[PDB]
Structures are given as structure tokens and as C-alpha cells.
Design a protein around this ligand. Structure first.
Ligand SMILES: CN[C@@H]1[C@@H](O)[C@@H](O[C@@H]2[C@@H](O)[C@H](O[C@H]3O[C@H]([C@H](C)O)[C@@H](O)[C@H](O)[C@H]3N)[C@@H](N)C[C@H]2N)OC[C@]1(C)O
Ligand SMILES: CN[C@@H]1[C@@H](O)[C@@H](O[C@@H]2[C@@H](O)[C@H](O[C@H]3O[C@H]([C@H](C)O)[C@@H](O)[C@H](O)[C@H]3N)[C@@H](N)C[C@H]2N)OC[C@]1(C)O
Ligand SMILES: Cc1ncc(COP(=O)(O)O)c(CN[C@H](CCCN)C(=O)O)c1O
Ligand SMILES: Cc1ncc(COP(=O)(O)O)c(CN[C@H](CCCN)C(=O)O)c1O
Lengths: 349, 349
């Protein structure tokens, strides 16, 4: 259990439950049997996390030359990597080539020009819109034609809705659109056999739109537009789905201020594990490592002199005391400063 | 010259060109506009080695806010006396490190901190920081705080405050200083040896600031005369951060990808998850600057710059008129030395 790694043992530290990942996978292979997962390394590049996912037979979605170097470092073969970054730096595209990574994405003619000059025989996937990335459908015909003139081996379509979804229809529409563009590619003599549904899948039960109400809507549309076919290969770039809940952060209360409301200061914040409050819209919940009081409105703060380095605003907590620990669960996604300790629960040695 | 030694090694990873001389000039201007105030450089702003060494040689003091910043400053030969542990709420093991390093001046703004101090660093010269939400004791609670410090046998040596850089009006400095006199007297009244006044930081580092440094030094010197007339027993200091380094750093990024629509979008190999974290953390508004001097009646078009990351939030510029650029061409960003720093850094002196 995690619930007692921590309870077994003042710098902040991470407790990572690898077993929670293995469970996330099983649930994936179940709710989306047709979709092969390519883990968005950017979400959490922890070594054990990558190795664990590797062993589970997963693929990796690298978006930079370093992520590729990292994945290739743990023995993962090039074939299992997708350089899913649309606009890539030439020296990088060059690194991918030299590393055996032949699948990359793109969303504009320009990228194709760079590819033609640097990685000609690269299997290219056309990412479509669902602001910064994704070619509009209307411009796809023109793009493909140009890829034709550039002798680019276009092997599929991809998209990404993101995690800010309230409604799963977005997945249905993006997939319908993918068929449309898929046909054009096939129409222009392009060998279209890959469908990338991206990421944005809930890593917690915390969020209203369940993973499973999503897999459902996806499988439906995936049946109405991409019926089974041995030539076809469907993948996704899940990031937070696999690691959000696997990480639990333990911070130590370093200073207090009373006034009846409290103000606690912990040794980690926005300039660290909590950069996710500013970068990823994260809303966290402080959780005492103490057994359950009169509760009072509180606020937690990072150890930094920056008045913006605030972790919690107004959360009811029991009166805490300097030196006592505070926990934050669901801190594995876009958070990794805290050493990392792993735990493998409910699993057959 | 920068404007040209950049226009030397561009003979495509991003790099910093730091003009140390711009720092030496910043100092002279300080010793001139604020002769009575000794500067303690807020290391947090930019901890570059040459920057610290340069400031050291210029006979400046250092405002460290953590155990590492102290270790760093102590590392370049700077003596403990020239350091002020200006972080109000400090982690005990840290307070312990300061002690062991000879750093005896620290700040505080609540009784609590005093308790920690009494148990860990008794003979520490403590500076009470006042309000100008996260830091700064209100004046109304200062009497009570001092009394408690008395009961704790704390050697309270002064007052401090911080208005920050979000100032439109310098009066704030005048009021904070008036308030500092008031609390200064109480300390003296309770038998406390009050002989230090810390005016904090928040002084312009760029010539783009509405509020001039010099209209500020003026208002400060005025109030400093009406409340803290010269006195050999008195010592006045400040914690300037951005003033000394903002304009000394010039960032060079390489355009790695492009897209058209008449408007343009550019992708560079650095952004919010790096040197540009200042757009999210420090309210920075940057200006892209071609490294290809201009030509004529050039046609300029609305553009946008973007970080190399898959994050749609990794946007550097929104809508800025620039000439049509081309992948492989450089883009410059000036005034990027404050709260921005591994793009390799290059130094011009
Ligand atoms: C909506 N957020 C959910 C929520 O259901 C949450 O449950 C926590 C639960 O974990 C806490 O219980 C905690 O107790 C101990 C800790 C040392 O005190 C640990 O074992 C562990 O953190 C947890 N079991 C409980 N005290 C409050 C609920 N909100 O569990 C995780 C979550 C998915 O983020
Ligand atoms: C917006 N920053 C202001 C600004 O006045 C700036 O001067 C720039 C000047 O640096 C630029 O001129 C630039 O010229 C070349 C580049 C090839 O064009 C660069 O190599 C060089 O660093 C720079 N001097 C000029 N194009 C506009 C002015 N506003 O100087 C710094 C500053 C005062 O903070
Ligand atoms: C090509 C691509 N593939 C997978 C994922 C993974 O998303 P998720 O982890 O939700 O499944 C992302 C998410 N990148 C940032 C995330 C913002 C981070 N601060 C976003 O703005 O969605 C992406 O751009
Ligand atoms: C006690 C203390 N003394 C000096 C400085 C230096 O400020 P400046 O460099 O402007 O002079 C700081 C910087 N704190 C954040 C900075 C926010 C960083 N994004 C702020 O709100 O200005 C501080 O907390």
C-alpha cells in the first residue's frame, strides 16, 4: 500500500504506485481493445514509469529529441515510438532519423518541406484541428497535394481534443473528420493506414466526464467510420490517463501563521511539483497524514518569496503544526525537487 | 557590443548573450540615485555565476532566500556578513544551514518564525518585515510581535518591507518608509537595538517601465530624509533584483518552423517551459526582434511566436508585426535577464 510507505516514514517526497499504472493499462485494453496506446512521455518521464509502461507492451509518444533519446535508452525499439510533434527543429528531425524513428506528425506544407530535405522516407501522419496545432479540413486537400509534389509518404491522420472536455462528442466529430481526410489521402494514392486519436483521457474519477463514457463514444464513432481492418492500425497518445493517480506527494509544513483561519507554508510549490497549477490548470486538495476535529479555513503556500507561489486558497483543514506532513494525491501528471519512491501494490511477485 | 557579437557566432540552439558591463553601469546609477542605500542583490532574480561575481566585485551585498542561494553566494568567496537571509518563513534545517554558514541576519513577520529562531539560531540579528497577503506583518500586530520577541529574547535589529514591481505610483515607497519609522520606534521603545532599514526591491530593470527608477529614488530619498535622517548608527539597505540584470541579458532563439494563412506564425526552440516561464511567473511581456537588421518600407505582417512544446499554452508572442521570417533565421528578445534563468549563456564584458 502507499497509504503506509508514507505512514511508515523533512524534505518533500513522491510516493509512486507503479501498480496503479498496471491497473490503468488493463482498464485501457478493456475499454479500448482496438486502440494501441503510445504514452505521451511529456506527461511524466519518470524512469520506472517508462519502464513499467514498456513492459506492459505500450508504445511511446515522444515530442522531442531528448524524449526519444530517453525512451530509446530503456531498450525500447524505434518502431514503438511516434515523434508526435507537428513543428520539429531540423536537427531534431535529423536525430529521429538517425535513431530509427520513422513516424512523425505534421499539420502544414512547411513541415513537409523540412521533412523532404531531412527525412524523406518518413511515414508522416497528418494531424487535423479539433489554434497552435492541427490543419483545418478545408486546407487538407491542398496540403496532401503538396505532400504529393514533395513525394511524402503520408500514412495516416491524427487529432487531439485535449483534457478540457465536458462533452465526448468532440471525439466523435474528430473521428468522423479523420475518415474524410483519410479518404482524400487514399484518393490521392496515399497509403492511409494509421489513425491516431491523441490524448486527453481522464486520469482520475475526480473529473465528471468518465474515461468509460468516452471510450464508449469513441468505439461507436470508430465503428461507424473505421470498421475493423487488418490493414488499419488505430493508436492514441494518452498522457495523464496512465500516471495522474499513481503519484502521491508528501510535503512538510515548514511554518504557520494564525489569525480563526490558518496559513501553512510547505517546502514545495509552484516553482516545482506545483507548477501544474499554472501550466496545467491543476486544482489540488491538501490531505493531512493524520488520522481524522474542528476544521478551519486554511491556505497553503510554497516556500518561495513569490506571492504567487500559493498552492491552496481556502480549504478547511484541522489545525496543523510545523513539522507535520501534508499530502497531495493525483500528482503524477505534468508535475515532475521531491525524490521519488515507488510502491507496487496488489500484484503477484 | 552585443548587438553585434551575436552578429559574430551566428557563423541552431538558442543562446543568451549577457553584457556584464550593463550591470556595472546599473550599479554606478544606483550609487548615484541612492547613495545612502546599500544594495543586497536578490539572487533569486538571476543566479548566473558571472552575474554574482560581477556584483560581488562591485562591492554589493546579496539577498539570499534559501539554503542553496546562500551556499552559492558563499561559494564565490563572498563573506557571510554581506548576506541577508531575507526569507520570512524559513525551514528549520535551512535556518540551521544559515547559522552554520555564519549568516546572522534574517527576516520574519510573525511570532512563530521567532519561536523557530529561538530554538535554532538564538543570537541571530532579526529584521521585522512589515506589510506594504503572503508576507509582511501588519503594523497593528507589530507591537504584540515585538513584545513576544522580547519574551523570546530575540535580537531584533530593524525593519523591512517590499512593494514589488507592480507599482504605478512611488508613493507606496514613501508610505512604507513612514510606517517603518513607526515600527522602528516601537522596537527602540522596547529596548530593541533598531539600526537597520531594508527598503526591499521592485526597482525597474528596463527602460520600458513607465515609472522611472529615478523618480522612485527621488521619492525614496525624500521620505528617507523626513523619517530616517543620516545617522552613523543607522544602516539602510535594499534588496534589488531586476534592477541589476533585466536589461543585461539578450536571448537569441532560432525559428524552427513556420506557417502562413495575410499573417504568420513562428515556432522557436525556447518558450514558456524555459527562458519564457517569465510570461506566466513574472507577468513578462516580450518583444520579438529580428537579428537581421531592417531594410526599408519592408512589408510587415501580424505574427505570433510559439515555444517548441506540444502545449498550446506554450505561446511566446501573440500578435506582433514582423517581417516575413524564414526557418533557420534568428529572433532576438532583449531584457531577458530577470527571472528567466540551460540555453548556453555567453558573456560580453
Ligand atoms: C475526489 N478526489 C478523490 C477522493 O475520492 C480521494 O479520497 C480521499 C482519501 O484518499 C483520503 O484518505 C487518505 O488517507 C491516508 C492519508 C495518510 O491520510 C492515505 O492512505 C491516503 O492519502 C488516503 N487513503 C480521505 N481522508 C479523504 C478523501 N477525499 O481519493 C483520490 C481522489 C481520486 O483524488
Ligand atoms: C525594446 N527594448 C528597448 C529598445 O530601445 C532596445 O533598442 C532596440 C535595439 O536593440 C534594436 O537593435 C538591434 O539590432 C540588431 C538586430 C539585428 O536588429 C541586434 O543585433 C541588436 O542586439 C539590437 N541593437 C532595434 N531594432 C530596436 C530598438 N528599439 O534597447 C533595449 C531597450 C531600451 O530595453
Ligand atoms: C500530441 C499530444 N499528445 C498527447 C497529449 C497528452 O494529453 P493527456 O496527457 O491529456 O492525455 C498532449 C497534451 N499536451 C498539453 C497538456 C498541458 C500540460 N500542462 C495540452 O495542451 O493538451 C498532446 O499535445
Ligand atoms: C524580499 C524580496 N526582495 C526582493 C525581491 C526582488 O524583486 P525585484 O527583483 O523586482 O526587485 C523579491 C521578489 N519577489 C517577487 C518576484 C516574482 C518573480 N516572478 C515579487 O512579487 O516581486 C522578494 O521577495
Amino acid at each position: 500500500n502507499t497509504r503506509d510507505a508514507l505512514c511508515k516514514k523533512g524534505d518533500p517526497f513522491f510516493v509512486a504506485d507503479l501498480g496503479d499504472i498496471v491497473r490503468k493499462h488493463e482498464t485501457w485494453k478493456k475499454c479500448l481493445p482496438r486502440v494501441t496506446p503510445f504514452y505521451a512521455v511529456k506527461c511524466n518521464d519518470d524512469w520506472r514509469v517508462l519502464g513499467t509502461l514498456a513492459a506492459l507492451g505500450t508504445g511511446f509518444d515522444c515530442a522531442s529529441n531528448t524524449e526519444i533519446q530517453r525512451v530509446r535508452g530503456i531498450g525500447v525499439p524505434p518502431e514503438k515510438i511516434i515523434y508526435a510533434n507537428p513543428c520539429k527543429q531540423i536537427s531534431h528531425i535529423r536525430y529521429a532519423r538517425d535513431s530509427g524513428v520513422d513516424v512523425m506528425t505534421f499539420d502544414c506544407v512547411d513541415e513537409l518541406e523540412k521533412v523532404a530535405k531531412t527525412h524523406p522516407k518518413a511515414k508522416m501522419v497528418l494531424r487535423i484541428s479539433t489554434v497552435k496545432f492541427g490543419a483545418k479540413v478545408e486546407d487538407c486537400r491542398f496540403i496532401l497535394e503538396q505532400a504529393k509534389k514533395l513525394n511524402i509518404d503520408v500514412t495516416g491522420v491524427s487529432f487531439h481534443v485535449g483534457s478540457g472536455s465536458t462533452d465526448a462528442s468532440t471525439f466523435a466529430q474528430a473521428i468522423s473528420d479523420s475518415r474524410f481526410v483519410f479518404d482524400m489521402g487514399t484518393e490521392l494514392g496515399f497509403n492511409m493506414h494509421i489513425l491516431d486519436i491523441g490524448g486527453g483521457f481522464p486520469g482520475t474519477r475526480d473529473a465528471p466526464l468518465k474515461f468509460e463514457e468516452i471510450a464508449g463514444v469513441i468505439n461507436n464513432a470508430l465503428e461507424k467510420h473505421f470498421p475493423p481492418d487488418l490493414k488499419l492500425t488505430i493508436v492514441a497518445e494518452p498522457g495523464r490517463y496512465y500516471v495522474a493517480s499513481a503519484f502521491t506527494l508528501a510535503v512538510n509544513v515548514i511554518a504557520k501563521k494564525v489569525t480563526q483561519s490558518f496559513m501553512y507554508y510547505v517546502n514545495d510549490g509552484v516553482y516545482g511539483s506545483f507548477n501544474c497549477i499554472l501550466y496545467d490548470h491543476a486544482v489540488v486538495r491538501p490531505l493531512p497524514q493524520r488520522e481524522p476535529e474542528k476544521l478551519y479555513p486554511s491556505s497553503v503556500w510554497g516556500p518561495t518569496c513569490d506571492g504567487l507561489d500559493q498552492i491552496v486558497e481556502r480549504y478547511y483543514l484541522p489545525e496543523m503544526q510545523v513539522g507535520e506532513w501534508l499530502l497531495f494525491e493525483d500528482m503524477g501528471a505534468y508535475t515532475v525537487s521531491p525524490t521519488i519512491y515507488y510502491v507496487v501494490s496488489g500484484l503477484p511477485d
